[PDB]
Every structure is written in C-alpha cells, then in structure tokens.
Amino acid sequence: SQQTRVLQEKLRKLKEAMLCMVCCEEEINSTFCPCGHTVCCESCAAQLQSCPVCRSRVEHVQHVYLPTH
Amino acid sequence: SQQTRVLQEKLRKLKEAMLCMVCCEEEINSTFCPCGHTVCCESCAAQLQSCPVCRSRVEHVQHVYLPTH
Ligand SMILES: CNCc1cnn(-c2ccccc2)c1
Ligand SMILES: CNCc1cnn(-c2ccccc2)c1
Ligand SMILES: [Zn+2]
Ligand SMILES: [Zn+2]
Ligand SMILES: [Zn+2]
Ligand SMILES: [Zn+2]
C-alpha cells in the first residue's frame, strides 16, 4: 500500500543517517574528540585534521561500539 | 499489507537499539572512555565506575552528537 512506501522511506532514511558523511559508503563508528561529532567511519576520521561539522581541531579519534552496528 | 507489518517491526527494532540500556527511556548520547562502549544516556553514564558491557574502568565519559539524534 502507500503506507508500505512511507515506512520503506523512513527505514531508508534512518539507515542513511548511520553512513559516514565523507565517503557515504561505510558505517559511522568514530568520534572526533573533544567536540564529540560522531559522523565518520574510521578511515575518513583518520584523514581529517578538523571536524567536518564544526571545524574544531581533532585532538584524537575515539572508536565507538554502538548497539546499531 | 503484511509487508507494511514487516517494515513497522524493522523500524521499531532500529529505534529501540538507540535507547539507553539502563533506563530504556532516553536516547544513547554518551561513550565510556577508553573502552568505547556507547550504550547509555548522559544521566545513567554519569554514575557508573565500570563499563556495564565489558567491566573496564571508566576514565571519563565523552558526549556524542549523532546524526540519528
Ligand atoms: C549522516 N549520513 C549522511 C550520508 C552519507 N551517505 N549518505 C547516503 C548514501 C547513499 C545514498 C543516500 C545517502 C547519507
Ligand atoms: C540498546 N537499546 C536497548 C533498549 C533499551 N530499552 N529498550 C526498549 C525500550 C522500550 C521498548 C522496547 C525496548 C531497548
Ligand atoms: Zn568514510
Ligand atoms: Zn565537531
Ligand atoms: Zn539512561
Ligand atoms: Zn566497555
């Protein structure tokens, strides 16, 4: 039905919100510290000197183990 | 249809995976450091000495800003 389409689109958007904002291919699993933005996979986070959301310098990257992984 | 039910169930489980494992009411937004388990809201994480998943000592809690928030 039309409701099946609405739910498929909601599910798609929630899964896309878990994808790395730089490569668009891998799951987010890394936090930029100290700002706390958690928007990248480990490979893209290792290559950024400043946060792609807030431009704060990245002091270090913290791996996150999320139940959604 | 039956497919609408299947999608409703999938959506529900993905949303439940984002809830604090301790209070079951607030969204996860905190990481235990250095282990990296990200399973609690700020209030429940504040008072734990050891990680509730792996028992490692919590040296500090890092706030996380997730796109799913
Ligand atoms: C926070 N996530 C942003 C993001 C990264 N990638 N995509 C994406 C990828 C393929 C198709 C549609 C969307 C969304
Ligand atoms: C990782 N999240 C675990 C969790 C916490 N709470 N709930 C939950 C709450 C209400 C209804 C169904 C499930 C799941
Ligand atoms: Zn990436
Ligand atoms: Zn940032
Ligand atoms: Zn809680
Ligand atoms: Zn842990």
Is residue B19 situated within a structural domain?
A: yes
Q: ω into residue A67 within 30 of 0, thus cis?
A: no
| B36/A7 touch (CB, cutoff 8 Å), yes or no | no
Counting Cβ atoms within 10 Å, is residue B55 exposed (0-12), middle (13-18) or buried (19+)? Answer: exposed
**Of residues B20, B11, B9, the one with CA closest to residue B64:** B20
Give the side-chain half-sphere CA count within 13 A for B43. Answer: 9
Rg of chain A, C-alpha, whole Å = 14
State the amino acid at position A47 in one-letter form. Answer: Q
In sequence order, what E strands does chain B have? 30-33, 60-63
Domain coverage including residue B30: 2-63
Is residue B68 situated within a structural domain?
A: no
A30 bridge partner residues: A40, A63
Q: How far is the CA of A7 from the centre of ligand 2 (A)?
A: 20
Domain count, chain B: 1
Is residue B56 situated within a structural domain?
A: yes
Structure tokens belonging to residue A44: 């893209």
CA distance A33 to A11: 30
Q: How was this structure determined?
A: X-ray
